[PDB]
Amino acid sequence: ATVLLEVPFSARGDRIPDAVAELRTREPIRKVRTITGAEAWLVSSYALCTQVLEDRRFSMKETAAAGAPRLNALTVPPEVVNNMGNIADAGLRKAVMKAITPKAPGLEQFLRDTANSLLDNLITEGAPADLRNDFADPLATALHCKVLGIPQEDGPKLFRSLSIAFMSSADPIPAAKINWDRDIEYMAGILENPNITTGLMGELSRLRKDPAYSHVSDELFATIGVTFFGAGVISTGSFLTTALISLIQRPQLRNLLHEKPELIPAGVEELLRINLSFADGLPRLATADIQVGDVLVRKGELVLVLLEGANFDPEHFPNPGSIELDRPNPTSHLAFGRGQHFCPGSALGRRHAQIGIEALLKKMPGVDLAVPIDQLVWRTRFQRRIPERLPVLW
Numbered sequence: 001a002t003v004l005l006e007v008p009f010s011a012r013g014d015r016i017p018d019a020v021a022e023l024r025t026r027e028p029i030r031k032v033r034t035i036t037g038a039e040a041w042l043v044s045s046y047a048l049c050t051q052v053l054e055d056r057r058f059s060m061k062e063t064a065a066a067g068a069p070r071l072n073a074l075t076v077p078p079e080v081v082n083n084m085g086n087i088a089d090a091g092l093r094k095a096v097m098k099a100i101t102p103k104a105p106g107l108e109q110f111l112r113d114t115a116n117s118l119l120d121n122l123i124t125e126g127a128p129a130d131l132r133n134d135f136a137d138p139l140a141t142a143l144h145c146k147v148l149g150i151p152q153e154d155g156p157k158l159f160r161s162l163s164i165a166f167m168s169s170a171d172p173i174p175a176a177k178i179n180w181d182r183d184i185e186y187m188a189g190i191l192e193n194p195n196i197t198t199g200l201m202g203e204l205s206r207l208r209k210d211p212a213y214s215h216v217s218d219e220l221f222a223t224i225g226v227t228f229f230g231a232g233v234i235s236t237g238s239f240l241t242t243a244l245i246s247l248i249q250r251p252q253l254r255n256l257l258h259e260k261p262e263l264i265p266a267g268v269e270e271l272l273r274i275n276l277s278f279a280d281g282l283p284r285l286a287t288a289d290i291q292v293g294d295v296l297v298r299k300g301e302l303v304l305v306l307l308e309g310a311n312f313d314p315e316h317f318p319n320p321g322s323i324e325l326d327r328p329n330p331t332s333h334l335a336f337g338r339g340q341h342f343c344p345g346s347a348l349g350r351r352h353a354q355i356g357i358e359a360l361l362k363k364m365p366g367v368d369l370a371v372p373i374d375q376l377v378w379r380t381r382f383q384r385r386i387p388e389r390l391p392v393l394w
């Protein structure tokens with residue numbers, strides 16, 4: 001007797017299990033058990049992943065409903081699962097999205113400056129260097145303090161909530177509420193701080209006192225700061241970290257991008273395509289009976305959209321495991337999702353990785369792992385796949 005297939009399959013972010021392709025071929029929508037003991041449908045082909053993400057009857061917000069089958073426990077209040085919906089309903093979507101583009105004057109130069117300073121300090125200290133804790137994540141943290149308009153020196157404390165805030169846990173996490181409430185109070189103080197006049201929090205602070213927003217809640221304004229800092233920092237820091245591994249593992253590509261850095265954007269788009277940073281499928285709750293491939297998904301059932309299922313699908317991306325800079329469909333991957341909940345920070349995420357990689361290849365053209373790849377320690381029961389340390393030499 002075998003048990004129902006359990007998800008996630010592997011916390012390793014350096015390789016895709018051979019099992020994903022066998023699943024995609026034989027049963028591209030398959031029943032699985034999550035860590036909570038709930039049943040769910042795991043979707044693993046490009047065609048069916050797109051279908052789910054583009055049909056809003058597969059709901060994000062309803063995943064938070066009491067009594068629903070769960071992928072994992074909430075780490076925030078349930079109303080925050082509908083964060084972007086709440087932002088749109090408050091009339092704030094255009095302003096938020098404008099504040100988190102990489103286009104603000106001086107932003108990209110700040111990113112470059114920060115990356116080079118981080119790398120210079122690593123070089124002064126001498127190999128080995130930890131590219132996650134001492135490059136990718138500080139670069140993400142500094143970027144998001146700038147984007148939000150908050151002091152750089154506040155970044156590290158906000159950052160240290162994230163190893164718990166983005167856990168993928170069977171059960172509620174008492175520390176998540178402690179940190180969440182503290183971080184909300186911090187962001188509420190930011191909104192009252194007259195020195196905070198730039199970035200996203202500077203803009204929200206003005207809109208908060210504009211008569212057209214007088215009935216928007218102070219809680220929502222604070223929540224935008226906490227959620228956009230955490231989602232942004234965890235997503236960019238984790239993506240850049242595992243993209244660096246994929247690059248380091250490909251010396252020919254490393255050398256090509258070093259020699260022809262105008263190809264870095266195409267390279268980053270392929271690194272996004274092959275990225276395993278998301279540790280779980282994206283969850284949706286069916287709000288109707290909906291046919292997905294050979295399965296009639298029933299109202300109230302949990303669906304998990306496996307991003308690397310779509311992104312390594314050979315029917316859509318031939319030779320899917322190979323980084324190819326001349327694909328005809330290069331941004332058609334699902335690294336940023338698709339549909340109603342397509343990532344609002346996609347352009348910022350791209351530029352964070354492009355600038356970080358550009359700076360690394362210039363400063364560290366000989367970069368290589370300083371330990372055998374199997375010695376990386378992959379974080380478990382987390383919403384991202386990331387190595388606890390990334391030791392390199394150059």
Ligand code: HEC
Nearest residue numbers: 084231232235236239282335336337341343344345348349
């Ligand atoms: C500064 C903010 C920010 C940054 C930077 C950002 N994200 Fe997002 N992302 C969000 C938010 C907020 C949402 C939720 C959007 C919604 O629900 O409409 C989201 C949504 C997503 C989704 C879809 C989730 C779903 O269930 O449909 C994916 C996938 C994603 N992000 C990946 C990434 C990746 C990969 C990166 C970086 C390489 C990144 N994000 C960077 C804020 C960000």
Ligand SMILES: Brc1ccc2[nH]cc(CCc3ccnc(N4CCOCC4)n3)c2c1
Nearest residue numbers: 060075076080081083084227228230231235
């Ligand atoms: Br938006 C935002 C930002 C910070 C957050 N912290 C806790 C939550 C709620 C759980 C949840 C549900 C659906 N998507 C997400 N994310 C966040 C990670 O990237 C993918 C989209 N998160 C939350 C939501």
Ligand SMILES: [Cl-]
Nearest residue numbers: 064065066067
């Ligand atoms: Cl409910």
Ligand SMILES: [Cl-]
Nearest residue numbers: 150151152153
């Ligand atoms: Cl500062």
